[PDB]
Structures are given as C-alpha cells and as structure tokens.
Amino acid sequence: ETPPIVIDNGSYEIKFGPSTNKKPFRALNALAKDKFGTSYLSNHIKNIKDISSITFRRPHELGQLTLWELESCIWDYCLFNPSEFDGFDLKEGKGHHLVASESCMTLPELSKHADQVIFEEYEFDSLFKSPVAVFVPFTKSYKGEMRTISGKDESDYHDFQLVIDSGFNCTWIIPVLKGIPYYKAVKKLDIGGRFLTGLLKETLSFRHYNMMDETILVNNIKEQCLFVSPVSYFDSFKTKDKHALEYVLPDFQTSFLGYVRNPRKENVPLPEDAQIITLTDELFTIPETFFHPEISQITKPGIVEAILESLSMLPEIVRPLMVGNIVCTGGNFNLPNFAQRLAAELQRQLPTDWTCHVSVPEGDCALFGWEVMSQFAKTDSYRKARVTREEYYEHGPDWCTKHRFGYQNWI
Amino acid sequence: IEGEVVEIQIDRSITGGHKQGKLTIKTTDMETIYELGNKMIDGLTKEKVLAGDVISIDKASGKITKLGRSVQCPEGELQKRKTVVHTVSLHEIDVINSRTQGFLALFTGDTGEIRSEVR
Amino acid sequence: IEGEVVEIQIDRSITGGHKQGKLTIKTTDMETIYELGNKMIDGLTKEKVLAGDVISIDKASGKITKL
Amino acid sequence: KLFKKNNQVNRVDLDFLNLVFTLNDKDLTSYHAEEISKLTCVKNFVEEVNKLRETNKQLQEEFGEASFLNFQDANQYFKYSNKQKLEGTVDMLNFLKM
Amino acid sequence: KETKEVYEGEVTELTPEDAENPLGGYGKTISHVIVGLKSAKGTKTLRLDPTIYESIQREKVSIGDVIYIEANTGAVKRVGRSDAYATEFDLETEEYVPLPKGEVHKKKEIVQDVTLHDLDVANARPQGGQDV
Amino acid sequence: MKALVEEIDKKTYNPDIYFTSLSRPVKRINYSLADLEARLYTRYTQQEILQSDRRFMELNTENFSDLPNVPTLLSDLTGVPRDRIESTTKPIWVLKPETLREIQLSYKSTKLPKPKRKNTNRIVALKKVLSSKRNLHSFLDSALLNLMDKNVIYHNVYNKRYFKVLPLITTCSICGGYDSISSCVNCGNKICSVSCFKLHNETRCRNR
Ligand SMILES: Nc1ncnc2c1ncn2[C@@H]1O[C@H](COP(=O)(O)OP(=O)(O)O)[C@@H](O)[C@H]1O
Ligand code: BEF
Ligand SMILES: [Mg+2]
Numbered sequence A: 001e002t003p004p005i006v007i008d009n010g011s012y013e014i015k016f017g018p019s020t021n022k023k024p025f026r027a028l029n030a031l032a033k034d035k036f037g038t039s040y041l042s043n044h045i046k047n048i049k050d051i052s053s054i055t056f057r058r059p060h061e062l063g064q065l066t067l068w069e070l071e072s073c074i075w076d077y078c079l080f081n082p083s084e085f086d087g088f089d090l091k092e093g094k095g096h097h098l099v100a101s102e103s104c105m106t107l108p109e110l111s112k113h114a115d116q117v118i119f120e121e122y123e124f125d126s127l128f129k130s131p132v133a134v135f136v137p138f139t140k141s142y143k144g145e146m147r148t149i150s151g152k153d154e155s156d157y158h159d160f161q162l163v164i165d166s167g168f169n170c171t172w173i174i175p176v177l178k179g180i181p182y183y184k185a186v187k188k189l190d191i192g193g194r195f196l197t198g199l200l201k202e203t204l205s206f207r208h209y210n211m212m213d214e215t216i217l218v219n220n221i222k223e224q225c226l227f228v229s230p231v232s233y234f235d236s237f238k239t240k241d242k243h244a245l246e247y248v249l250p251d252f253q254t255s256f257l258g259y260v261r262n263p264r265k266e267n268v269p270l271p272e273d274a275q276i277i278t279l280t281d282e283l284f285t286i287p288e289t290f291f292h293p294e295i296s297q298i299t300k301p302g303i304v305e306a307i308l309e310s311l312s313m314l315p316e317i318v319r320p321l322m323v324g325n326i327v328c329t330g331g332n333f334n335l336p337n338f339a340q341r342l343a344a345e346l347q348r349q350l351p352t353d354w355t356c357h358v359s360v361p362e363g364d365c366a367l368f369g370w371e372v373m374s375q376f377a378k379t380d381s382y383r384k385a386r387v388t389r390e391e392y393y394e395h396g397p398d399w400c401t402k403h404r405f406g407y408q409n410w411i
Numbered sequence B: 001i002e003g004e005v006v007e008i009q010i011d012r013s014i015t016g017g018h019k020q021g022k023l024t025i026k027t028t029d030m031e032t033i034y035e036l037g038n039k040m041i042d043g044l045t046k047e048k049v050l051a052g053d054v055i056s057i058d059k060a061s062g063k064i065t066k067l068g069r070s071v072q073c074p075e076g077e078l079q080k081r082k083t084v085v086h087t088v089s090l091h092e093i094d095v096i097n098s099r100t101q102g103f104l105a106l107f108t109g110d111t112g113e114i115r116s117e118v119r
Numbered sequence C: 001i002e003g004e005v006v007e008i009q010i011d012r013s014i015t016g017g018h019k020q021g022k023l024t025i026k027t028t029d030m031e032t033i034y035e036l037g038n039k040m041i042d043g044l045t046k047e048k049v050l051a052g053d054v055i056s057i058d059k060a061s062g063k064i065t066k067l
Numbered sequence D: 001k002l003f004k005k006n007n008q009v010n011r012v013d014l015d016f017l018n019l020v021f022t023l024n025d026k027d028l029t030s031y032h033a034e035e036i037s038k039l040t041c042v043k044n045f046v047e048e049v050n051k052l053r054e055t056n057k058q059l060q061e062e063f064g065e066a067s068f069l070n071f072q073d074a075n076q077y078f079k080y081s082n083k084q085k086l087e088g089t090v091d092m093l094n095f096l097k098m
Numbered sequence E: 001k002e003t004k005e006v007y008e009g010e011v012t013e014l015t016p017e018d019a020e021n022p023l024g025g026y027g028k029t030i031s032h033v034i035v036g037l038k039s040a041k042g043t044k045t046l047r048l049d050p051t052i053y054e055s056i057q058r059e060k061v062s063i064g065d066v067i068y069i070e071a072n073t074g075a076v077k078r079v080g081r082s083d084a085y086a087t088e089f090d091l092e093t094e095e096y097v098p099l100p101k102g103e104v105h106k107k108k109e110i111v112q113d114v115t116l117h118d119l120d121v122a123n124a125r126p127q128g129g130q131d132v
Numbered sequence F: 001m002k003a004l005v006e007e008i009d010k011k012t013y014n015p016d017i018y019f020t021s022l023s024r025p026v027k028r029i030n031y032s033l034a035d036l037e038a039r040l041y042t043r044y045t046q047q048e049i050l051q052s053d054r055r056f057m058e059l060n061t062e063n064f065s066d067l068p069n070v071p072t073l074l075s076d077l078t079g080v081p082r083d084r085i086e087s088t089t090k091p092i093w094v095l096k097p098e099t100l101r102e103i104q105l106s107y108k109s110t111k112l113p114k115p116k117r118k119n120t121n122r123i124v125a126l127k128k129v130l131s132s133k134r135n136l137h138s139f140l141d142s143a144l145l146n147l148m149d150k151n152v153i154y155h156n157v158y159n160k161r162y163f164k165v166l167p168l169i170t171t172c173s174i175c176g177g178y179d180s181i182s183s184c185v186n187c188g189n190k191i192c193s194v195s196c197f198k199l200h201n202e203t204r205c206r207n208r
C-alpha cells in the first residue's frame, strides 16, 4: 500500500482519512448514554433526540487514554464502516501504512500499550507515530493558504519553528529545533475546552437557572457565539451593550438545536413561544482567562508567562529566532481575533530588537494539522522515518517506545 | 462618592505593607468599605475627619469636600455620573493665561495691558 | 592653567584631613605633577572632579573651572 | 488643564538653540567661552563614524542583500545574527550623529 | 526647525549602580542608573548618568508610572500612572494614562514659527531659575 | 476651615495610627467548634491554593457523577492526604459488559473483521491489555512508572519562575463591573452596583 492512512487521535474529535483524501473524516471520541440507559455511538451522538441529561464517557482522561477497549471499538467502527463514510473502506490493513498523532507527554505504559495494540491487533505493516508538533515544520514542503500576523506591525522542512496548540484537553507550548522538539523547555497549560465549557455553564447558572446537567447545548453555544476581547477587557466591557447577543434555546418538540439571534439584523422576524437568553458579558469574559486568570478566581500563571518561561529555558542563541516563526493549532484558536491579540500581547513584553511573528491557518486548525501530517507522509523523509513491522518483532515492545517514538530518547 | 462615614482606620508602615487604610461610607441604600492606597490616606489625615458626617470625595481630583454633619441625609449609590459646567468670559481666560497666577488679577484689577498675542 | 587631569590621589586614610594629595595634568605637548595644599583639597571637594576631564585653574585666586 | 493640551508637537525649547543668552553672563566669562568654542570635540565623531562605516560596508558587500531580509532571517542562525549586527551598528552611528 | 529625540514609556524597573572605588575624588555616588521602558511596540533598557537619576528621583516616580525623557536637555516629566494599575485600589487620587505608542525612543522635529518680538520678550523676561 | 490648634493627648494620640469610629443589635458569632479551634490553634497561602485547584478540578469535570471521585485524583496528583483535604476543603462506572454488548449491537450495522487467534504469550498480553478496566489512578500509583518519570511529567512541565507578568485585574463579583469597586463589609467580596449588592447579600454572602 503506497498511500498511507492518516489518523489524528484527539480527545474531543478524531480525524482519520487516507493520505490521498484532501480532508479528514470527522468523528467524535466518546460514548453517550441517556438517563434511560440507551447508549449512542460518538458519530450517532448528533443524531440523538434528547439533549437534556447526557452522561459522557470517553477513553481519553485528562492526561492520556487508559481504557483501551473503548478506543479499539471506536477505531473498529471508524475504520470498518464503508457505508458510514462514503468511499472509504478498509479490508484488512495488512499492507497499509499508518501515521498517528498522540499526546506529546503520553505515559510509557500507555505508549507501549498503543504500540502493541496497533502492531498486533491491526496487523499494520509500517507505522510512524509522533505528536502533532513534529509534523508542523514540514509545511514548507508544500504551498498552501497560510495567514501571518506581525506583532510589531500595527531539506524542505524548517529547523526553527515554535508550535503552540490549544486543544480540547489542554494547551501545550512546544519549541522544536531541527524537527526534534525540545522537551526540556516544553511548557503546558491546563486551559482547555473542558475549562471553558464548565466556566460558561457556571456563569449561566449564576445569571440564569441551572443548566450544568446540559453539556452539548453549552458546547454549541461556546462554539457559536464566543469571542475574545479585540483590544482589552475594559474596551469590550464598555461596548458590551452594543456587542450583545441573544440565543434561543431549542425546543424538543420543534428544534433539536437552537440558534443565535443578533438584535442588529432583522432577517429572523418569526416569533417563537420559547424563551430567549441574552448574552452580553459572557461573550468575551470566558476567553479572557487565557490572559487574566484572576477573572475566573484561579491562580494559574497564564499563556504569556508560560511562553516567557519556555523562551527563558531555551538557549539564548535561538530565542529571537523562535518568536519569528510561531504557528497556532487547535480548535480553541477558532475564536476570532485571538491570534492577533496574542501576537500583540506577546510583542508588548518582548524587547524592541525582537520582532514577533504569528502564523495561523484559515478554517478549523484540526483539519490543517491533519493535512500537515498527510503532507509529511507524502514526504520522502517519512519513508526513512517509518518503522517496519519486522524490526518491531525483532526488538522488544519497549524498545520502540523508548528509542524511536519515546520522548525519553530526546530528553 | 459621598455619604455618611461610619468607620475609618489607618495604620503605620510595616514591612508587610507601606500603608493600610480602610474606611466605611454608609448611604441610605449602601454601606461598604474601600481600600486606601497611601495618597488618599495622606489626604484624609491632612484635615481632621470624624465619623458620622456627610463628605464628598472626588476620585479624579483627589480632593475632600465636607457637606455637613448627620443635618442632611444620604440619597443612594455612592458613585454617580454627572458633569460640571463652568461659565467663563474671554477676559477671564486671557487674565488667567497672562500670568503665573492670573486669576487673582480677576479681582485686584492689576491685569495691566494683556499682550495681544495672548488674545 | 588649563589642561586635562590624568588622575587625582588623596590620602584620606593614611593621614586624613588634607594629607597633601597629588594630581597629574596632561596636555597634548606636555604633562607634569602638582602638589596640592589643604585649601586646594577643600576647593576641589566642591565641583568634584573624577579625572579624565578638561579643567582650567586660576593662578591668582585658585578658582576651579570645569571646561 | 484643558489648555495644557500637548504642545511638544509644535513647540521649541528656545534655550537649546541659545536664544535666551541674556542669562549667560551670570556664570560664564568671556575667555572660558572662547576657549570652549575653540575646543569643540568635532571631527572625532566623524572619525568614529568612518571607522564604524568601514565594517558596516564590509558586512553590507558581504551579505547585506539577504541579511536584513525578513524571509532569509526567519530561520537562519547566521543571517539573523548578521542582520542584528547591521541594525546595531546603524543604531550606534545614528546615536553618534545625534 | 530643530530635531529632538525622546525616550518615553512605562517604567518597568530602575536600578542604581554604585561603584566600589572611592577614587579619592568623591565619597559616595552612583556610577549609573539602569531603567527599562515599556510601550506597545516593545521594550527597551537605558543607562543614565547621576544627573538624570537625581531629576527622576525629584519627580517622585516609582515602578508603574509613565514618564517622559528628553535626550536634548535631559528633561524628565512624569506623565502619570499607567491605566493598567487602575484596579489596584478601590479609589486613587492619581489619574491614569494609556500606554504610549511607539517602541520606546522616537525621533521628531518641530517647525514652530515664532516672530522676533517673542524672542525679544523671552530674552528680556527669562523663565528659568528656581531662585525665590 | 483647617484648625491650626488641636488638642492632643500624649499617651493617647499617636501619628502612627489614626482611628475614628461612631431586631436586637447583636454581632455575628460563629458556633462551629472546628472553626473556633482552627483559629485558636493557628503569593497566596496553601489554603487558597488548595481551594483554587479543587474548584478548578471540579469545574474541569464534565459530569456530576465524577465529581465525588475528583478529590481523590486531585489529592493523588498533589500528594496531599486525600481525606484531610476532603474534610478541610468543602467542594463548591464507565464500562459495563451489558453496555459492551449493546454497543456491539449498535455498530453491528457494518463491520468487516477477520477473526484469527493463536495461543501465544503475546496474545495473552493483548487480551490482558484489551480487557483492563483500570482507572488512570491505578496506573498512577502503580510501581511500573518510575518516580523520576512522574516528576518530569507532572512537576517539571509547569512553569516555576514567572508567576505573574500581566497586571492584576479585579472586577465586580456579580456582573464584572470595574469602574466602581467596593469590598463587602462581611465577606469581603468586591461589589459594584445596587442590584449586584442585593443579589450578593442573600445568595453569595455565605459569611453573613
Ligand atoms: N467553531 C468553534 N468555535 C469555538 N470553539 C470551538 C469551535 N470548534 C471547536 N471548538 C473548541 O475546540 C476544541 C477542540 O479541540 P481538539 O483540537 O478536538 O482537541 P483534541 O484534538 O485533543 O481532541 C473543543 O473543546 C471546542 O470547545
Ligand atoms: F489534547 Be487536545 F485536546 F488537543
Ligand atoms: Mg488534540
């Protein structure tokens, strides 16, 4: 099988698809069972009727995944359902090649479990698994749509690339040199989709009735009508009256999912008996925890402190070079104007001689990363990087995850 | 801000804090405590202030105005939005800008041939 | 007498109290060493000089001027 | 306060340019002023500017076509150092002129 | 027309540097003072002689105040405290000023036009001197 | 205006300290014996740190069912005793074989497996891994993982020097207002407006 398969293991959503395919196939990673006990698959969660009381179960814990059977079931469903996903169909995968993305700080126990499972259960001929950060320096191999933001202004792979991501689980700061991440200087942040969703739930429960039992609706609200402060918290607060939005809660009798109503536009004039919740302060207050954790009554440092610490740990020779090449990945960065505000804030604390540059993909960043590892698989360096099945059989199971795909090797 | 003041505490410098000062202003609707950051502590200690009298504090100017003793009654929120309008003639502006302390010449009448470029 | 001063040394600890310090004045063509009295030290304490400066001294009244 | 709106945009100190000479007689004598006018430290800044611009032109003719370029200096440990050195020496020459 | 260069921005830190050598010529003085300035475009550090340090000390400026340094005459004036510390206390006498634009140091010129009579008046009526 | 001459008592007056002051009127008394003994026998302190991280972890959870199990995991990660922090700090299964068969029937709509089994030690390890039902806690306190590895994974990734760089921001506890900030008399919570104060009094003024 000359064209390998591209799989992105994500805590929230799983991105899988052949390297030939342009876009990944979106698939959630969770099992939802209603109050009555009826359980629904991840892809079938959006097809359910009742969203009032849902209990979410996923193999991915806060650090890594521990329940491998559920992950294996999800992978079997996603890989062997040609009817579910148009065109795609996997018969055996014996000769296929797989490129996987995992957590940059996965536990060695779970790492070896993953290696054994993928090598034996799926009978894959060759595999190359690494964190998403390693694949980013290979974007120079192809020409694509890339946006750039300058903080100061108002082989094929590149050695110098600072990669920052904000996933559903958490946020990591990774400095990468020569394509090898600098694990000593790697910094992490606990801010993630769960934190924002829970904070939105608590704020709405304080300003309205209690909806903490509802999570899908709050997640949809956050993904629809949440944005970061364009200039500062005070500027947004002063104009928060103008920047006011009203969300119509869905009615199970009529609509499964609600919609956002903007008072400025009149294209939705139809009345509806269902109540409407207005959102003025919460539109930008929740995203502000990235820069000002004190708003949410937490003592966490923040993104800028983490970036400064990571730069300080790095050798001084490459410190100015790192900020010149910064790329943002993850679903949390889909919020508007987040990248420009981040660039301005980081440039403010930087010395004058150093220029801040930020690169951001258009559209969802998860698809961008999936295309990134697909392009890496297309690269000739992948052929030398990938590990054969026979070599894994010859060596011990721990040798691969301690030498080739193990962060301890690069420590 | 304005209203009846019920509690004022002021402490000397310690290694923990240069100056800690808490005051409590009670109105008809409200009664809360503010934190004094040194400068207003000095301003309040400049003139003797006793609890139970109506005072007005201008945050921008940083000056203290006493409205009397509790003779009057509070009204509501401590902080409110208002604008002050001043009616000044051109001659008064010229005299003010013509000297180190020109506004005194408004009354003493010693302006003395204000220069034309000033006008 | 105008000229850049090389360095000024005063024995404030060996004897203390105008111990007759010495300073060297340098020009582009010549340079010598002068002996300084108590009043010289008292005057030089005012308008402190940290060497490497071009100054002119008055022969009559002994006035210190920093050029 | 309303009249103290920013004037430094359209104001001149008028003392830096020696147009308030009426108070110079309080502390300065004629011979000291003549000597200080004769002993100007000019032609030394020119020498330093020349000695810096020699190496500046050397670095220019060496690699300055791609040194100051943002794309070339984005990922290069040597080109970026050359560009930062050029910026530094330009800053020193400008400061010396001032 | 005259050209002036100005260092301005929020005061991050200031540090006196005292030389350990008495050198005989002085008893106790600071060799230099290092002050870092911050603005929107970036940050920069400066090294100042004791005169400017004495001036800024007379200006009564601590960390967190936006200041204004003029390179020509060494003039130092305190614009005010940066608005970032507005919420530090419940109330405050000091006004708050937004962080200035420009990196730290700016170059500009003034083309103010003045008639000769103003020059004569200024020469006849000096404004300098702190004497009583 | 200003009084030029003021009566001053030497032992009473002190420039260091300036103090002035003014159904049944009764102060508030705490009747909790635990609180009283805690007061008697005793940049943020460890208590505030513990409360903040406990609140953060409770909010990080997605379901109510996992809330009571969160403090055990938090204590294991922090290393503090579990029951002690649970008692001292006041807050605020996944797999089933029948569910397994139900999900089997759920995705039995389309499947293309190739069954094949051989009795080997590697297959035994595969079966053990697949049927694990081990919590993340079970892996955490397991002796398989080296202590240095755990320290690197947990206590090393977090930053240590730059505690805070951006200026502190304090807003109204109810609506987030900032122009008018006033601490509550009893509970010390920052309040801004009339409606916010009224809503705080009966709901969030726990110490009242
Ligand atoms: N349109 C959107 N607007 C705002 N936030 C979004 C949007 N889409 C997704 N997100 C957020 O992005 C996160 C997805 O993270 P993800 O990249 O899936 O992490 P992982 O790859 O580890 O699963 C979710 O927590 C969600 O809250
Ligand atoms: F681990 Be994440 F949510 F990308
Ligand atoms: Mg992810």
Ligand SMILES: [Zn+2]
Pocket (backbone or CB within 6 Å): F172, F173, F174, F175, F176, F177, F191, F192, F193, F196
């Ligand atoms: Zn409020």
Ligand SMILES: [Zn+2]
Pocket (backbone or CB within 6 Å): F184, F185, F186, F187, F188, F189, F200, F201, F204, F205, F206, F208
């Ligand atoms: Zn209260």
